[PDB]
């Protein structure tokens, strides 16, 4: 009923994700998924079944697990539609064809997809049968992609069925190339190249941005699905500070696995030492800022109003501290 | 007795493989490790014992696919005895640790181990199982690393068990680096890193090759066993002509599955047009030799002999043309 009402903000930073998952019986990823489809008219562009759509997005959403309180459902349909409104930037109209749009999406809604709940490194250091699989490069990130394609073999799941074969292949890459990219450990590389393309940028006298090979492209929309799994402290305070308690309990439940197996504390996961403010001040200090203040620049100046609300979240919780 | 003649060539370049191979009742893997472990005197070195060295080369033996031509367990005895010779090359004595060279001919071991015979673009265009798990990118290298070391895990089958968790540690990263390394779409940048450090390397006061850097070192280590990757056109031409025909067998197995299935047949897998000879010659003169001429350079004059047997093979493939 009501779901269709917060839905009608699906194309605004701040949407209510925490109550359409209430409000959905627990979809938000299915929910939010479908209506971006229709907003940007994708259903007709590529020809995907409505029914499709949604065999899918639901087998999707039941690989993400329901009892981890950060890397769930509602983070994926969180990053879904935050990427969703970071393709609608001025300052990028015209730069992404159709298919660049749809993987970017896709990308998004699989990225974290069936995820245990701890860091790669915790199952690297476990011996983890998922590090042993992939070699301890982007374990978490490399599992996402290969359970997020493998569900488009279920029964009425290729949501991708009337894509041309070259059209698959290269939605394909593009997913993996940004899936990949989501990976922490890369996020310095990746700011690193989102600065140099601040520097030389190139740009119409009228506002919007100039990309020409598929490598500045996919760069950006590296950097852009990285802002959206990043843009929890960009959002309204009651938004971030749900998804501040969510990742603490997963930082201290893993803390809690570390501690009873008798290993290392990671860092930020010692419940009985952790500054949850002081870690989030910090986290955006040198990682959030940094990133959104580039992306502010490359868009300048459409991200005004969300680099606007950092800084105030940012100054909140500063002056939660003594 | 006969065997044991053999391998007393086991320190020398052309060590006729096939024959140890028959003479070991199709074991060249597990008889060629043992003997080279022991030369370097391993076992002791890293507390390693025998029935465990013995166990677990058994076991990987077995993974890989006596029904394949060529990446079988034979190329993987020979990659094994050429990295072996090739660490020790007089401008390389004293550079690696023994850790250093057991990743090394631990790598080697384990390179191509559950080879399926077909390439990677085979796999990603088949939209195989092991394409899907590990998202296009160095399929079979990741997924050879991924079995050997697995295998450690079975039975009285963990060679490293009285390493320290460090040696583990460095070992396991130093093996993925060295493996991954072997993917042929990565032969043009790491040629050209190869090159760039030949061009600017450095001697020490013993006049041996000076490493003072992971980079450098573990570089050094994957052009290694790349060169014995790609080494038998510098074997002895009745080793390297049955290699040809083990390759082209594989080659024509997998055109003759791409044809079955209306798929184009890849360069050289067609044997109703393929030219044996000229993609020899070719193979040499755009990738062998290359890469061979640039390692030479880093170690001369130690291997003016295979260089020069290279260039003896290439003549005579060349001459079967007119
Ligand atoms: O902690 C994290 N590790 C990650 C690894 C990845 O490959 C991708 C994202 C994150 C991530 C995200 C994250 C998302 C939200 C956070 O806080 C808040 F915004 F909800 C947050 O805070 C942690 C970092 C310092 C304090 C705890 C971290
Ligand atoms: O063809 C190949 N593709 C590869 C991909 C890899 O990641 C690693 C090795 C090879 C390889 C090796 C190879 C090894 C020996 C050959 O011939 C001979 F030396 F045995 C050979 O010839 C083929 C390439 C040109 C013609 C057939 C190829
Ligand atoms: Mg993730
Ligand atoms: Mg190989
Ligand atoms: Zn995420
Ligand atoms: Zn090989």
């Known amino acids: 009923?009501?779901?269709?009402?917060?839905?009608?903000?699906?194309?605004?930073?701040?949407?209510?994700?925490?109550?359409?998952?209430?409000?959905?019986?627990?979809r938000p990823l299915t929910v939010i998924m479908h209506t971006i489809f229709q907003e940007r008219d994708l259903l007709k562009t590529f020809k995907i079944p409505v029914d499709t759509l949604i065999t899918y997005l639901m087998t999707l959403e039941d690989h993400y697990h329901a009892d981890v309180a950060y890397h769930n459902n509602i983070h994926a349909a969180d990053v879904v539609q935050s990427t969703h409104v970071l393709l609608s930037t001025p300052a990028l109209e015209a730069v992404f064809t159709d298919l660049e749009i749809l993987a970017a999406i896709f990308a998004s809604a699989i990225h974290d997809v069936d995820h245990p709940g701890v860091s790669n490194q915790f199952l690297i250091n476990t011996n983890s049968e998922l590090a042993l699989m992939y070699n301890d490069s982007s374990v978490l990130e490399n599992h996402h992609l290969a359970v997020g394609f493998k569900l488009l073999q279920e029964e009425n799941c290729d949501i991708f069925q009337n894509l041309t074969k070259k059209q698959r292949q290269s939605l394909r890459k593009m997913v993996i190339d940004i899936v990949l990219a989501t990976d922490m450990s890369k996020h310095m590389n990746l700011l690193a190249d989102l600065k140099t393309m601040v520097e030389t940028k190139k740009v119409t006298s009228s506002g919007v941005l100039l990309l020409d090979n598929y490598s500045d492209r996919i760069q950006v929309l590296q950097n852009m699905v990285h802002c959206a799994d990043l843009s929890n402290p960009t959002k309204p305070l009651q938004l971030y500070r749900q998804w501040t308690d969510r990742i603490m309990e997963e930082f201290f439940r893993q803390g809690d696995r570390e501690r009873e197996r008798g290993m290392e504390i990671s860092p930020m996961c010692d419940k009985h030492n952790?500054?949850?403010?002081?870690?989030?001040?910090?986290?955006?200090d040198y990682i959030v800022?940094?990133?959104?203040?580039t992306w502010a620049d490359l868009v300048h100046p459409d991200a005004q109003d969300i680099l606007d609300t950092l800084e105030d979240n940012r100054e909140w919780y500063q002056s939660t501290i003594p």
Request: charged share 25%; glycine share 8%.
């Open 289 to 293: 800022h940094p990133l959104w203040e």
């Open 274 to 284: 952790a500054s949850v403010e002081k870690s989030q001040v910090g986290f955006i």
């Open 1 to 26: 009923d009501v779901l269709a009402k917060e839905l009608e903000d699906v194309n605004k930073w701040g949407l209510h994700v925490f109550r359409i998952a209430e409000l959905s019986g627990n």
